[PDB]
UniProtKB/Swiss-Prot annotation, chain A:
Transmembrane segments: none
Protein name: Pappalysin-1
Shown residues within the full chain: 872 to 1033 of 1627
Binding partners and assembly: Homodimer; disulfide-linked. In pregnancy serum, predominantly found as a disulfide-linked 2:2 heterotetramer with the proform of PRG2.
Record's comment on post-translational modification: There appear to be no free sulfhydryl groups.
Tissue: High levels in placenta and pregnancy serum. In placenta, expressed in X cells in septa and anchoring villi, and in syncytiotrophoblasts in the chorionic villi. Lower levels are found in a variety of other tissues including kidney, myometrium, endometrium, ovaries, breast, prostate, bone marrow, colon, fibroblasts and osteoblasts.
Gene from which this protein is expressed: PAPPA
Regulation: induction: By 8-bromoadenosine-3',5'-phosphate.
Length: 162, 50
């Protein structure tokens, strides 16, 4: 159930977030029970590297990999696709079940065709694309090989015409 | 005596440039005087289908 009487005696582990520009003492000393973090002291031009350590008691574990955030530039949830950073798509989902993942990469057999990266499934779709010719043989027809050429029937006759 | 082996080949598969011929036999009395290879003096289908 939602509140078992056996897990009540287990103390949850906590997280502490360290920034590459140091924060104030009233911000860096607190410990967050949840995984959600907000801060207000930011500058419009300076970058910030964030990494969060995960403590259980007094012992401190290894730091997480750092994330570079710019208060003026974008990220993988801004809704604006930036192809200079390697983003194939950029939506606000942060959910891997959609066609565009949270790591700014589109999933297998998907294609996003807009600035907020709305994506559609193209294997069962009836419209052939530029890239769809060599992969989906079930929509663009039979793949002609590079060394040969296929020619179809013209003025064909049948036996039991009706 | 000049036994001829028709090379069986499908045109859907791309062509190949033959280089060597291996003849294998288990009886000791088979004596080979010479092997050969028949080709086209009209066209070569490898230099065009690169």
């Amino acid at each position: 159930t939602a509140d078992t009487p056996l897990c009540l005696q287990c103390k949850p582990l906590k997280y502490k977030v360290v920034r590459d520009p140091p924060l104030q003492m009233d911000v860096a000393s607190i410990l967050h029970l949840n995984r959600k973090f907000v801060d207000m002291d930011l500058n419009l031009g300076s970058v910030y590297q964030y990494w969060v350590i995960t403590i259980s008691g007094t012992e401190e574990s290894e730091p997480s990999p750092a994330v570079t955030y710019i208060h003026g530039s974008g990220y993988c949830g801004d809704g604006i696709i930036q192809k200079d950073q390697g983003e194939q798509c950029d939506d606000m989902n942060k959910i891997n079940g959609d066609g565009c993942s949270l790591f700014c990469r589109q999933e297998v057999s998907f294609n996003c065709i807009d600035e907020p990266s709305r994506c559609y499934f193209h294997d069962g779709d009836g419209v052939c694309e530029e890239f769809e010719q060599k992969t989906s043989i079930k929509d663009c027809g039979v793949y002609t090989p590079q060394g040969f050429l296929d020619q179809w029937a013209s003025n064909a006759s049948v036996s039991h015409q009706d | 005596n000049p036994l001829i082996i028709p090379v069986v080949h499908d045109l859907s598969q791309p062509f190949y440039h033959s280089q060597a011929v291996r003849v294998s036999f288990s009886s000791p009395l088979v004596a080979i005087s010479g092997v050969a290879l028949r080709s086209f003096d009209n066209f070569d289908p490898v230099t065009l289908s690169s």
